[PDB]
Amino acid sequence: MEMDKRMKSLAMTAFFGELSTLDIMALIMSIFKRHPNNTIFSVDKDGQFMIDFEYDNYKASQYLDLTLTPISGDECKTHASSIAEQLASVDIIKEDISEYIKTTPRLKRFIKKYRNR
Questions:
Q1: Signal peptide: which range, if any?
Q2: What is the sign, positive or negative, of the torsion defined by CA atoms of 6, 35, 16, 75?
Q3: Is 99 helix (H, G, I), strand (E, B) or coil?
Q4: Taking the mean position of all CA atoms in its chain, how far away is CA 55?
Q5: Any residues with CB less than 8 A from the CB of 69 and at least 6 apart, and which?
Q6: φ, ψ (nearest 5 deg) of residue 77
Q7: Sheet holding 49-54, edge to edge
Q8: Neighbours of 22 (CB within 10 A)
Q9: What is the rounded distance in angstroms from the CA atom of residue 3 to the CA atom of residue 33?
Q10: Element (H or E) spanning 16, and its range?
Q11: Distance between alpha carbon 67 and the CA centroid of its chain, in Å?
């Protein structure tokens, strides 16, 4: 019944602000080989759209100390564009995680910094 302390720390310190909600979803997959139970279309304080990812008892947005409200039907038209981008990314991620990491510098770094004795 836990969010990994090390990851949370890295996301909030060494990578503060660099990581998106999809990023976290990716890292979790890559590092813990664990997948979301489901998806949550959502939006933040400033109204930026973002897919969130629900696990056992925590959301990916929580590794980033983020406060997201679910999306309203009315908003769904406003964000159609972003919704597509992100849905795309998720597929690319789901398709070859290993490749996605190698290809995305921020994520490669994070995996490195994550593996320190």
A1: none
A2: negative
A3: helix
A4: 12
A5: 42, 43
A6: -70, -40
A7: 49-54, 38-43, 69-70
A8: 20
A9: 14
A10: none
A11: 14
| Nominal resolution (angstroms) | 2.7
Q: Which residues pair with 117 in a beta bridge?
A: none
Structure tokens at 101: 């990491």
Q: DSSP assignment, residue 115? A: S
Q: Where along the chain do its domains lie?
A: 1-117
Residues 113, 110: Cα–Cα separation, whole Å: 5
Angle at CA of residue 89, ends 21 and 91, nearest 5°: 115
Tally of residues, the chain: 117
The letter for the amino acid at 54 is E
**Which experimental method was this entry solved with?**
X-ray
26 class by beta-carbon count within 10 Å (0-12 exposed, 13-18 middle, 19+ buried) = buried
CA distances, 70 to each of 11, 22, 23, 50 (Å) = 23, 16, 19, 10
